[PDB]
Amino acid sequence: MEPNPNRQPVELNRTSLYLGLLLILVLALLFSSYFFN
Amino acid sequence: MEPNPNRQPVELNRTSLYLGLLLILVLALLFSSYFFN
Amino acid sequence: WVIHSITIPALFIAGWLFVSTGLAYDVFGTPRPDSYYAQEQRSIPLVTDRFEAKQQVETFLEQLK
Amino acid sequence: MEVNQLGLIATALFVLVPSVFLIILYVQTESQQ
Amino acid sequence: MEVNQLGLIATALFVLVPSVFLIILYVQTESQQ
Amino acid sequence: REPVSGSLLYGNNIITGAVVPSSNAIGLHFYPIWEAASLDEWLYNGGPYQLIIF
Amino acid sequence: MPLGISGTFNFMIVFQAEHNILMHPFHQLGVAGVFGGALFCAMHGSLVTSSLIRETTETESANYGYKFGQEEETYNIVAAHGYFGRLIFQYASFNNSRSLHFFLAAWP
Amino acid sequence: GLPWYRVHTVLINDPGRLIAAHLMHTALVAGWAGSMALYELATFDPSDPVLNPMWRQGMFVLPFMARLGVTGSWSGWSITGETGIDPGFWSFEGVALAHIVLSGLLFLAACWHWVYWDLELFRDPRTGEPALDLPKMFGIHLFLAGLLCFGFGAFHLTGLFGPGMWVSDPYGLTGSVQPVAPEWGPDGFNPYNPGGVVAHHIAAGIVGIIAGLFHILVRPPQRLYKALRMGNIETVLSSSIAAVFFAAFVVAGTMWYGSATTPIELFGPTRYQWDSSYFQQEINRRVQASLASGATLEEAWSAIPEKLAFYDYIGNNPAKGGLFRTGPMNKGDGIAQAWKGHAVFRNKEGEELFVRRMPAFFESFPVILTDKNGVVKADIPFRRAESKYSFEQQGVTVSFYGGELNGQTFTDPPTVKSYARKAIFGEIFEFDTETLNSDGIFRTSPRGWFTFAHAVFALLFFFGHIWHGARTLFRDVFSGIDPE
Amino acid sequence: ITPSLKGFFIGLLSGAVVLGLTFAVLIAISQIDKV
Amino acid sequence: ARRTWLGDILRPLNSEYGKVAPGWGTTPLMAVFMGLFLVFLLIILEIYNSTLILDGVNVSWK
Amino acid sequence: GWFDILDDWLKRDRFVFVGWSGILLFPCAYLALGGWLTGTTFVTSWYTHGLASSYLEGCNFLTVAVSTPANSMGHSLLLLWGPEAQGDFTRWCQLGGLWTFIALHGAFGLIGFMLRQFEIARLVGVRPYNAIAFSAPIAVFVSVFLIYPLGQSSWFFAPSFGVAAIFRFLLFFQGFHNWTLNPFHMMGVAGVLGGALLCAIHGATVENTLFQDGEGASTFRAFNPTQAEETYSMVTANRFWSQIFGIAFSNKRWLHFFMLFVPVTGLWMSAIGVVGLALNLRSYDFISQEIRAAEDPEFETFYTKNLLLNEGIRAWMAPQDQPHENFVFPEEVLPRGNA
Amino acid sequence: PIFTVRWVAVHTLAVPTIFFLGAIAAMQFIQ
Amino acid sequence: METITYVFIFACIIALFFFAIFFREPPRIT
Amino acid sequence: SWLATSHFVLAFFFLVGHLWHAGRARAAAAGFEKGIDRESEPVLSMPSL
Ligand SMILES: CCCCCCCCCCCCC(=O)OC[C@H](CO[C@@H]1O[C@@H](CO)[C@H](O)[C@H](O)[C@@H]1O)OC(=O)CCCCCCCCCCCCCCC[C@H](CC)CCCCCCCCCCCCC(=O)O[C@H](COC(=O)CCCCCCCCCCCC)CO[C@@H]1O[C@@H](CO)[C@H](O)[C@H](O)[C@@H]1O
Ligand code: CLA
Ligand code: CLA
Ligand code: CLA
Ligand SMILES: CCCCCCCCCCCCCCCC(=O)O[C@H](COC(=O)CCCCCCCCCCCC)CO[C@@H]1O[C@@H](CO)[C@H](O)[C@H](O)[C@@H]1O
Ligand code: HEM
Ligand SMILES: CC1=C(/C=C/C(C)=C/C=C/C(C)=C/C=C/C=C(C)/C=C/C=C(C)/C=C/C2=C(C)CCCC2(C)C)C(C)(C)CCC1
Ligand SMILES: CCCCCCCCCCCCO[C@@H]1O[C@H](CO)[C@@H](O[C@H]2O[C@H](CO)[C@@H](O)[C@H](O)[C@H]2O)[C@H](O)[C@H]1O
Ligand SMILES: CCCCCCCCCCCCO[C@@H]1O[C@H](CO)[C@@H](O[C@H]2O[C@H](CO)[C@@H](O)[C@H](O)[C@H]2O)[C@H](O)[C@H]1O
Ligand SMILES: [Fe+2]
């Protein structure tokens, strides 16, 4: 019957895509050196 | 100005998600054995 | 039902003879039931190299016993 | 036992990248409307 | 030179999975009407 | 004495890995768990094969 | 049969050693049974996909036009009949789907 | 509203956006050929080119740059190894970096056209809809290509203005790069003679120009134009695949079979050099003549160049190797250290024995000992067997001639069969196993890999040639069948 | 003219003649009818 | 409709999109070469397999 | 209407339909078959393989075929005149040039069938998923009979166009090329079976759902092919399978297109492997286990046991199969078991 | 006088068949 | 390492099955 | 060896045969053996999963 009247779409604008794509790579770029060790 | 009147959204229904997710894993499951070698 | 009592019999007998006549032998160069090993010398008359075989097949066949 | 040392990355990328590429297209379709 | 043999997968998953997870959310937003 | 490892834990790709069938020593006898003397005896003679196919 | 992908291969080969299964006739039909299955699986798959009453735009996927529960015939027999009926002689084309599909499932 | 495998149809008519694609693709290929060059170069060792060449080194892209006459680098090492250098700006990094910079300038350029798709150039007056002239657009590109062909043939290959093509001796012993005098005549079609290959392009370019001149000047006929569906871009796609599909074989042919286009120094010797026993006939004939000249029979084998002998090996030829066995050939047996010599087996009575050399098929081949009569006067059993013709029973004396150790006799089960099991591979070599951590299991050369990639990709485009070929003709109907 | 060269010439000639003959036949046959 | 420097230059080139040589135009001269090219290509093939030995050519190495 | 009148004649309606391809097909095809039978009956293979399998000596139906020109006869195309045949017919059959006569005339014929399978369409209006589907045997035929031989010392290595001929070609891979384990060939056995399977399961389902248009128990004649609604309910079949195997097809379109897909994709991914095996890139020993096998003889897998089998096949089959190599193996050297 | 429609098919096909049947039968009595 | 990848790959297959059987969107009629 | 081979093959079919008629027998008694009824499909009205 009722499909949970409470729902919302998830929104991430273009900017907050960059920061992560930037943040992830940097942390990797920073932590890849140790993972090779 | 005009942003290319010719465009279309890409549509993949739920099923054609499974087949690939199935196909990929199987090919991997089949070809992973050789990649280790 | 006219010449189909003529064509088939006269034609089918031709194939009967080329075996009986053995004409198919030297036409297709198949070995003859006695002809494989000339003399004794049991070995494969295996043709070998190029620009030869026309002449080389004519060695193996030449002996023929 | 001994093995191709890098062969493992092969599977992972061959699994994930084609997989992911199907998800991304799919999640989009889910958002249509 | 010698290296952690599996250390490479680390980067790949640490790069892709967080990356991908940002794309999938984003492509959705692009589809919002 | 030739033991065969078709198990996956021992150095076997999916390709090479298989469940070995029962031995000849066991012959065709019905060979359930309890009939076998020891658990490891029941595995070493190829029990799990005769168990799966039934 | 040792059950496994290498185990199976080991089985046949050894089985081939003793009983010479290839020259056996029953197997030699089984091959025909499998191929002609795969064969017919292609044609009967092809000819009907070949003929599709078009509910779709060229840009849109061709499949989606089929609505689950269509009581229209999604594929022209008259069009596809003459096709295979012209490709080879018109006599063998198996007019009747109910006749076809059975033969489709008898052969394999 | 589009399937995931049709997504690029959106370009169908956007002639601007199209040019953006091809660029991005183009810019993306150069970046490959640029980068791979460095990577291949990064791991390459010039150190020992005499015994250990570039083909055996696993290096793939590199030998092409050499094929056109790019040799040396800034690191101060020539291909041939003498390392006297005047490399000029153009060397492996230079060729490499040039592509990378090329990849960039295209990539940027790609963004431009992608940004501005609409252009007053692409829409003819009579029809507001986009169009471009397929017959006319063709003539230019052709007339431009041939003019680049005739150039490449005249100025570069000839060495007129430029370096010369690679060329070699038939034995692969003489590494050389010279301007090739074009010879066009009956012989010019022997592909083992590059003197045609030059004259080819110079002859192609002219025919390249005249045609390119023609199609620009005139439009194709009505009845034809209607048939081929010219004006529907795909009909250029379908056709264009066939030509490429066609060429993909011919290279595989000239790569897999020998061609003077691809010398034996750069790419490993072709499969057929082994099977014909090309080298061994041509190694012995200089040894025979050397003994026909006269010397210590050791002295004869002593002056024979290793590199020649090194071409004679079973792990050498491309045929022997696995698909999923990966990496440079050196990973198979190790690096080649030095060359032992010619193992001669004597009966223990002094009568000389011949091993039966390994055909390309068998992975494990029975090691046999035969004499001039072809009979087996010694052998090896498999594991447990009753002893007849077992060399430990019937005696053997192995004495290496030439190469590292000479006149050094070994008689015993353990040491002889050590070589006897190696001997069937061809001439023996010392290998450094662990430096590269080799397993002792063979791998295929570049000449192999290059081919398999194209034969496959060819065989695909066949199916690719059909699929589009179907959709050029049927683009009218292809949307769907009409009722009855 | 090698035996090979000459032979090849012969082959090509024969081929052309055949295709020639076949085409001629088809044409004539086609021309014969006139629905 | 953005008319740029090149776009103004080239466009007069390909302006003719509909004008097609009437009738068979020249078909025949094409079919002449094509058939001739086929015979040509065949001669390459006959050579390279050493089916066709020209005097002086050697499919042996150099 | 010179060229014109020719066209409509070819495209007219007759018993069969001879298209533009027909000119190419029937002559090229009828010779292939027309050749094969002849070579089957009369032309021996003796001077080539040293062993006579052909219909005119004592040999049966199954064990006759047209062998191949020998190894040292090389890759030459063996034309009828040729340098080697020199226009002599007999020695052109004995050398097995008739083999190549079959392949080439076959291939073009095989092509000419494909083109026909187009030329039908454009004048009918069907979509050409038929021809495209037929490209799979093409690839298989071309790869097996053409690309594979060229990757060997001569034509000698190739199927001999016979029932038993193809078998000595089968084991020929298992011994040397270790074919079963080649993964590109596992995709094939998927395709064929996956074709055969779904072939049978479609034909069964639609045969088990019928609207009962006729009276008598047997429903075949019960079908009237006039503008009818679907002769079998998709509704039932769907809810049917969804409750047993769990997953069904809701699209007649998506179903059939999936039938066309699997057999085709089944062969191509096999036709790739064969090409990969023309170069002797054959899938073979896993470096993992082999090195491990060098660490003890006792370790055994159903892999390791195959290597002995593939070893025995080679040694035993070699002398007969490849007489040209002049192999003589001693007795003990054969890798016999119990050792 | 048969122009090509149908006659040309069988009579260029089944005729050799009758001619090989000679080879088949007349063989079985050899040896 | 070696084995643990196979089980993983083989796991997600099962996690697809159970997932693809029950959670499919029912194809309603009309 | 003949009998055991022979009777097996036959005995195999009769399994199929049994599994054949038992289908047609019950469906006949069930009345819809004559094919699904186009007027009212039994599946047509059911709870849709
Ligand atoms: C660097 C790399 C870069 C690569 C980038 C690209 C990567 C590749 C991407 C490729 C994947 C994308 C894709 O697959 O798309 C599908 C494609 C396009 O389809 C189109 O999709 C839409 C457009 O986007 C439109 O709808 C459009 O019209 C069109 O449909 O399809 C193709 O073009 C053809 C390509 C096919 C590829 C092969 C697919 C088949 C092979 C699958 C893998 C085979 C593995 C073999 C070994 C296997 C195993 C052992 C572990 C698996 C065991 C189970 C095997 C048996 C099940 C396999 C499938 C059987 C048939 C069912 C398929 C099906 O259609 O059913 C679907 C849902 O079913 C499933 O997904 C199966 C999931 C598992 C089920 C298991 C059952 C468990 C039983 C347990 C025992 C019980 C006792 C629903 O049915 C259909 O759904 C839709 C389809 O259109 C529609 O509703 C239909 O009518 C129908 O209902
Ligand atoms: C250079 C040659 C060439 C070019 C320009 C095209 C171009 C096109 N093809 Mg196409 N095709 C080709 C070769 C080519 N094809 C070949 C060889 C085949 C046979 C395998 C096909 C089979 C084919 C089919 C069956 C269809 C097309 C379609 C299309 C159109 C849309 C493509 C699309 O949406 O796919 C997008 C595809 C993806 C986004 C997935 C790509 C993932 C692949 C599987 C792996 C790629 C990874 C990487 C790039 C590998 C490198 C490739 C290697 C060769 C270097 C487009 C005009 C479609 C069309 O025209 O209908 C509208 C269509 O239905 N093609
Ligand atoms: C024409 C293409 C081509 C060719 C001939 C080669 C050839 C070669 N490369 Mg190479 N390479 C290429 C493209 C190519 N490369 C590209 C595009 C890249 C960028 C990713 C690289 C990156 C690269 C690296 C990083 C290295 C090489 C190396 C080498 C050499 C060793 C062989 C090897 O590593 O391959 C291995 C080959 C295989 C494992 C073959 C199996 C690959 C499978 C079959 C393809 C996938 C099929 C697919 C899963 C099918 C799915 C079916 C589904 C669609 C239904 C060899 C000479 C190595 C080297 O330095 O030389 C010694 C090396 O380290 N290459
Ligand atoms: C079975 C394979 C096959 C199939 C189905 C097709 C199908 C198609 N091709 Mg084609 N093609 C093929 C192979 C094939 N081709 C090959 C191998 C080449 C060489 C690269 C080409 C080159 C080619 C071009 C250049 C063009 C097509 C085009 C087309 C399309 C329409 C016209 C046509 O059918 O021409 C196909 C015609 C033939 C295949 C000719 C028949 C075969 C000849 C007569 C054999 C004669 C050989 C000769 C006697 C010498 C052989 C000696 C021996 C030693 C080899 C159609 C989809 C046209 C197109 O784009 O359509 C829009 C087009 O412009 N194709
Ligand atoms: C974001 C998108 C990314 C998509 C990536 C998806 C990857 C999926 C495939 C992965 C393959 C991994 C292979 C593992 C072995 C390995 O590692 O080969 C390596 C090079 O491989 C390679 O050069 C792979 C490329 C091969 C080029 C030829 C392609 C032929 C196409 C086949 C026909 C078309 C179907 C080099 O080998 C390694 O490095 C060598 C030393 O440098 C040694 O051999 C090592 O032991 C080790 O083998
Ligand atoms: C030298 C051999 C043969 C000759 C000269 C010959 C003669 C002819 C001729 C001239 C015709 C056309 C005129 C007519 O139908 O009365 C014909 C028709 C026919 N004959 Fe023959 N015949 C021969 C062999 C055969 C064979 C072997 C068969 C085997 C079935 C056969 C069966 C037929 C058939 C079926 C037709 C009908 C042709 C059609 O319907 O287009 N004939 N025959
Ligand atoms: C912009 C710019 C620049 C830069 C540049 C660069 C930096 C670039 C790079 C680029 C590059 C460096 C690129 C590369 C890439 C490559 C690629 C992208 C590859 C890929 C490929 C593929 C994908 C493949 C596939 C495959 C595989 C993977 C496996 C198997 C096989 C095959 C082949 C299928 C500069 C500074 C100059 C300046 C100006 C501007
Ligand atoms: C796709 C999802 C990925 C899931 C991956 C899960 C990986 C989990 C890793 C757990 C630890 C295994 O980590 C890895 O262990 C293997 C053996 O097991 C070690 O491997 C070592 O011994 C093995 C013996 O088989 C040799 O083949 C190998 O060359 C050598 O390095 C590696 O040095 C270590 O890197
Ligand atoms: C529904 C499916 C249920 C599946 C149930 C089982 C789930 C268990 C998953 C984890 C099991 C993986 O099993 C684990 O594999 C790794 C692979 O690196 C093996 O580890 C491997 O490398 C290590 C590292 O030195 C060696 O010591 C070891 O002998 C070797 O086999 C482990 O010995 C094994 O314990
Ligand atoms: Fe179907």
The three-state DSSP-derived secondary structure of chain K is CHHHHHHHHHCCCCCCCCCHHHHHHHHHHHHHHHHHHHHHHCCCCCCCCCCCCCCCCCCCCCCCCCCCCCCCCCCCCCCCCCCCCCCCCHHHHHCCHHHHHHHHHHHHHHHHHHHHHHHHHHHHCCCCHHHHHHHHHHHHHHHHHHHHHHCCCCCCCCCCCCHHHHHHHHHHHHHHHCCCCCHHHHHHHHHHHHHHHHHHHHHHHHHHCCCCCCCCCCCCCCCCCCCCCCCCCHHHHHHHHHHHCCCCCCCHHHHHHHHHHHHHHHHHHHHHHHHHHHCCCCCCCCHHHHHHHCCCCCCCCCCHHHHHHHHHHHHHHHHHHCCCCCCCCCCCCCCCCCC
Domain count, chain C: 1
In a domain, C45, yes or no: yes
Distance CA G15, CA F48 (A): 23
Strand partners, D28: none
For residue G51, the CA-to-ligand 1 centroid distance in Å is 23
Resolution in A: 3.8
> Which of the listed residues M17, M22, M25 should we mutate to test ligand 1's pocket, taking the one with most ligand atoms within 8 A of CB?
M17
Please answer whether residues H325 and H443 qualify as being in contact, where contact means their C-beta atoms are separated by less than 8 angstroms.
Answer: yes
Name the residue with the closest Cα to ligand 1, atom 35. K261
Residues in chain I: 35
Determine how many CB atoms are found less than 10 A away from the CB of residue H453: 13
Ligand 1 close to Cβ of residue D14 (< 6 A): no
Mutation test of the interface with chain B: which of F12, F13, F16, choosing the one with the most B Cβ atoms within 10 A?
F13
> For G22, what's the count of Cα atoms within 13 Å in the CB-facing half-sphere?
16
Residue with tokens 């998800």: D23
Contacts of J3 (CB under 8 A, 6+ apart): H119, H120, H121
Q: CB-based burial of residue C15 (10 Å sphere; 0-12 exposed, 13-18 middle, 19+ buried)?
A: buried
Determine how many CB atoms are found less than 10 A away from the CB of residue J58: 13
- At J32 the three-state DSSP class reads helix
- At H2 the three-state DSSP class reads strand
Is beta strand H335-336 parallel, antiparallel or unpaired with respect to G3-4? unpaired
Sign of the torsion angle spanned by Cα atoms J44, J47, J48, J54: negative
Please answer whether residues H315 and H425 qualify as being in contact, where contact means their C-beta atoms are separated by less than 8 angstroms.
Answer: yes
- At H431 the three-state DSSP class reads strand
Q: Which residue on chain K is closest to N31 by alpha carbon?
A: K217
Determine how many CB atoms are found less than 10 A away from the CB of residue A16: 14
Nearest alpha carbon to residue H164 among H150, H181, H177, H151: H177
Distance CA H61, CA H93 (A): 13
- At H37 the three-state DSSP class reads helix
> Which of the listed residues K31, K81, K111 should we mutate to test ligand 4's pocket, taking the one with most ligand atoms within 8 A of CB?
K111
AA identity, residue K1: G
Whether I and J touch (3+ CB pairs < 8 Å), yes or no: yes
Whether F and G touch (3+ CB pairs < 8 Å), yes or no: yes
Contacts of N32 (CB under 8 A, 6+ apart): N42
Nearest alpha carbon to residue H196 among J57, B21, J11, K182: J57
Contacts of H303 (CB under 8 A, 6+ apart): H290, H402
Distance CA H288, CA G5 (A): 54
Apex H394 CA angle, H393 and H398, nearest 5: 105
**Between G77-87 and G25-50, two packed helices, what is the crossing angle to 10 degrees?**
130
Q: Which residues of H313-345 are buried (b: 16+ CB within 10 A; e: fewer)?
A: bbbbbbbbbbbbbbebbbbbbbbbbebbbbbeb
DSSP state of D4: -
Contacts of K320 (CB under 8 A, 6+ apart): K51
Nearest alpha carbon to residue G15 among G29, G30, G33, G2: G2
Contact criterion met (CB < 8 Å) for K76 and J53: no
CA distance G108 to chain K (A): 6
Determine how many CB atoms are found less than 10 A away from the CB of residue J55: 9
Please answer whether residues H436 and H330 qualify as being in contact, where contact means their C-beta atoms are separated by less than 8 angstroms.
Answer: yes
Ligand 1 close to Cβ of residue M1 (< 6 A): no
Determine how many CB atoms are found less than 10 A away from the CB of residue H102: 17
Contacts of H127 in chain J (CB under 8 A): 17
Strand partners, H481: G53
Q: Which residues of H are annotated as a binding site for chlorophyll a?
A: 8, 22, 25, 99, 113, 141, 156, 200-201, 215, 454, 465, 468
Q: DSSP letters of H456-472?
A: HHHHHHHHHHHHHHHHH
Region I1-35: CATH code: 1.20.5.510
Residue with tokens 């002056």: H303
CB pairs under 8 A between M and N: 4
Ligand 7 close to Cβ of residue H107 (< 6 A): yes
Number of H helices, E strands in chain A: 1, 0
For residue N14, say whether it is annotated as part of any ligand binding site: yes
Ligand 7 close to Cβ of residue H338 (< 6 A): no
Distance CA H126, CA E24 (A): 45
Chains with 3 or more CB pairs closer than 8 angstroms to I? J, K, L
Structure tokens at C48: 């070998």
Strand partners, H370: H354, H376
Question: Is F38 touching B (CB cutoff 8 A)?
Answer: no
Nearest alpha carbon to residue J59 among H277, H335, K76: K76
Structural domain spans, chain H:
1-270+444-484, 271-443
Contacts of F21 in chain G (CB under 8 A): 1-3
CA distance C46 to chain K (A): 5
Ligand 5 close to Cβ of residue H441 (< 6 A): no
Is beta strand H409-410 parallel, antiparallel or unpaired with respect to H352-355? unpaired
Name the residue with the closest Cα to ligand 4, atom 28. H239
For residue K251, the Cα-to-chain-centroid distance in whole angstroms is 31
Contacts of L3 in chain I (CB under 8 A): 29, 32
Distance CA C55, CA C58 (A): 5
Ligand 4 close to Cβ of residue H474 (< 6 A): no
Atom of ligand 1 nearest to the CA of M20: 73
Distance CA G88, CA H67 (A): 54
Q: In K, what residues contact M, Cβ < 8 A? A: 235, 238, 246-247, 250, 288
- At F24 the three-state DSSP class reads coil
Task: Kindly report the backbone phi and psi dihedral angles of residue F16, in degrees, each rounded to the nearest multiple of 5, phi listed first.
Answer: -80, -25
- At H283 the three-state DSSP class reads helix
Name the residue with the closest Cα to ligand 1, atom 42. B23
Distance CA G37, CA K11 (A): 33
The three-state DSSP-derived secondary structure of chain C is CCHHHCHHHHHHHHHHHHHHCCHHHHHHCCCCCCCCCCCCCCCCCCCCCCCCHHHHHHHHHHHCC
Contacts of H223 in chain J (CB under 8 A): 23-24, 27
Ligand 5 close to Cβ of residue D8 (< 6 A): no
Contacts of B28 (CB under 8 A, 6+ apart): D11, D14, D15, M9
Residue with tokens 């054995």: B33
N40: left (phi over 0), alpha (psi -120 to 50) or beta: beta
Structure tokens at F6: 């078709």
Contacts of G63 in chain K (CB under 8 A): 251, 253-254, 257
Contacts of D1 in chain M (CB under 8 A): 2
For residue K55, the Cα-to-chain-centroid distance in whole angstroms is 23
AA identity, residue H40: E
Q: Which residues of G75-106 are buried (b: 16+ CB within 10 A; e: fewer)?
A: bbbebbbbbbbbbeeeeebeebbbebbbebbe
Ligand 9 close to Cβ of residue M20 (< 6 A): no
Structure tokens at H340: 């032992």
Atom of ligand 3 nearest to the CA of K265: 55
Q: Which ligand is nearest to the CA of H28?
A: 7
Contact criterion met (CB < 8 Å) for K126 and G51: yes
Question: Is K30 touching I (CB cutoff 8 A)?
Answer: no
Question: Is K244 touching L (CB cutoff 8 A)?
Answer: no
Ligand 9 close to Cβ of residue M4 (< 6 A): yes
Distance CA K251, CA K236 (A): 13
Strand partners, C58: none
Among E12, E32, E33, beta carbon nearest to D12: E12
Structure tokens at B35: 């990649």
Distance CA H431, CA H438 (A): 9
Contact criterion met (CB < 8 Å) for L5 and K14: yes
Question: Is K83 touching J (CB cutoff 8 A)?
Answer: yes
Q: CB-based burial of residue K72 (10 Å sphere; 0-12 exposed, 13-18 middle, 19+ buried)?
A: middle
The three-state DSSP-derived secondary structure of N9-49 is HHHHHHHHHHHHHHHHHHHHHHCHHHCCCCCCCCCCCCCCC
Chains with 3 or more CB pairs closer than 8 angstroms to A? E
For residue L7, the CA-to-ligand 6 centroid distance in Å is 6
List the CATH number of the domain containing C11. 1.20.5.860
Q: DSSP letters of G36-62?
A: HHHHHHHHHHHHHHHS-B--S-SSS-S
Strand partners, H368: H379
Q: Which residues of H148-171 are buried (b: 16+ CB within 10 A; e: fewer)?
A: ebbebbbebbbbeebbbbbbbebb
Q: In F, what residues contact M, Cβ < 8 A? A: 8-9, 11, 13-14
Contacts of C27 in chain K (CB under 8 A): 42, 89-90
Number of H helices, E strands in chain D: 1, 0
Residue with tokens 């007489």: K323
In a domain, C1, yes or no: no
Determine how many CB atoms are found less than 10 A away from the CB of residue K40: 21
Q: Which residues of K125-157 are buried (b: 16+ CB within 10 A; e: fewer)?
A: bbbbbbbbbbbbbbbbbbbbbbbbbbbbbbbbb
CB pairs under 8 A between B and D: 52
End-to-end distance of chain C based on CA atoms, in angstroms?
Answer: 52
Task: Kindly report the backbone phi and psi dihedral angles of residue H225, in degrees, each rounded to the nearest multiple of 5, phi listed first.
Answer: -50, -40
Name the residue with the closest Cα to ligand 8, atom 31. E5
Contact criterion met (CB < 8 Å) for K77 and J49: yes
* Domain of C24, in residue numbers: 7-61
For residue H352, give the H/E element and its range.
strand H352-355
> Which of the listed residues L10, L12, L19 should we mutate to test ligand 6's pocket, taking the one with most ligand atoms within 8 A of CB?
L10
Q: Which ligand is nearest to the CA of L7?
A: 6
